Structures are given as C-alpha cells and as structure tokens.
C-alpha cells in the first residue's frame, strides 16, 4: 500500500528532480524496469587529476529507502585513497551519516567533492593515502595516468 510503496515513490521523485534539473556533468537513472537498481556517470572534475575521464557507478537502493543509504560502487577503475579495487567508496553519508533528507543528487555531489578533496585519514587504499599525504604532486601524476589508462 502507500506505506509499502514509499521507497518506490521516493525514487521516482528523485529521478524526476534529477532529470528536470540535470546535475552538472553527472547522470543517473534506472538500468531497466527495476527502479531500485541504477547506473550513474560522473565526469572527472575540471582541473582535477581525473579531468577528461568518465566514471561509471552502480547504485542499489534498499527496500526501506530513504531510511537507509543506497549502496554505491564505481565500476570504472580510479586512483583515489577512498575508493578500492572493488569500487567501494569510503564516504560518511553512505554509512553513518546517511539521513532520509539525502538524495541521489546529493550523493553524486558528495562523490564529486570527494574526488576533488580526498580524505587520506580514512583510506580504503593505504598506499594511495600515503602518497596523497606525502607527495601530492606525485599523487596527481599517478591519478592522471590511471585516468588516461582506464577512464578514457
């Protein structure tokens, strides 16, 4: 009923907002007919090491959305302290900081911010976190190499 359909209706509302006011340089939407499974794309931010890259992500919404966060994973390889080989993302709003006021659009914005400003203190990839902290220029160079190698 209306309660049971809450998640579905909310996902539809978010999709309509996204499509109506397209988020800069990003896209996201259902893969097929299952509204709980989406794909997204993020363009590497300009003047970041990732510029010119296109990164693909998978989004799965929980049955109780919006009261629990979506599960989000990169399917494009990326060199970043907070994103692992499996494309898992260490991002506060995906875990302990989720709120039903958050939306897919906000998540995409947060991920874009994360790309621009990594959090080396809470890394998923220790060596990338170390290089980011110790030699930012070297980090940028390698992130650029990976962008050319796997995101273009």
The DSSP code sequence of 24-90 is TTEEEEESSS-TTEEEEEEEPPTTSTTTT-EEEEEEE--TTTTSSPPEEEE-S----TTB-TT-BB-
Question: Is 26 tagged catalytic?
Answer: no
Structure obtained using: X-ray
Token representation of residue 116: 């621009």
Identify the domain containing residue 38 by its residue range.
Answer: 1-152
Q: In sequence order, what are the residues at sequence separation of 6 or more whose Cβ sits closer than 8 angstroms to the Cβ of residue 143? A: 48, 49, 50, 78, 79, 80
Q: Helix 136-150 vs helix 126-134: angle between axes, to the nearest 10 degrees? A: 130
Catalytic, out of 26, 90, 112, 116: 90
Residue among 73, 36, 76, 72 nearest 56 (CA) = 76
Place of tokens 């506060």: 92
Contact by Cβ (8 Å): 116, 75: no
CATH code: domain of residue 142:
3.10.110.10
Resolution number, Å:
1.8
Task: Tally the domains of the chain.
Answer: 1
């Amino acid at each position: 009923g209306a309660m049971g359909s809450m998640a579905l209706k909310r996902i539809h509302k978010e999709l309509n907002d996204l499509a109506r006011d397209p988020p800069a340089q990003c896209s996201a939407g259902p893969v097929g007919d299952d509204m709980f499974h989406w794909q997204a794309t993020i363009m590497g931010p300009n003047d970041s090491p990732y510029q010119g890259g296109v990164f693909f992500l998978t989004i799965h919404f929980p049955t109780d959305y919006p009261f629990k966060p979506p599960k989000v994973a990169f399917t494009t390889r990326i060199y970043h302290p907070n994103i692992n080989s499996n494309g898992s993302i260490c991002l506060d709003i995906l875990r302990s900081q989720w709120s039903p006021a958050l939306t897919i659009s906000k998540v995409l914005l947060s991920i874009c911010s994360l790309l621009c400003d990594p959090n080396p203190d809470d890394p998923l990839v220790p060596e990338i976190a170390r290089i980011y902290k110790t030699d930012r220029e070297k980090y940028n160079r390698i992130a650029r190499e990976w962008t050319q190698k796997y995101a273009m």
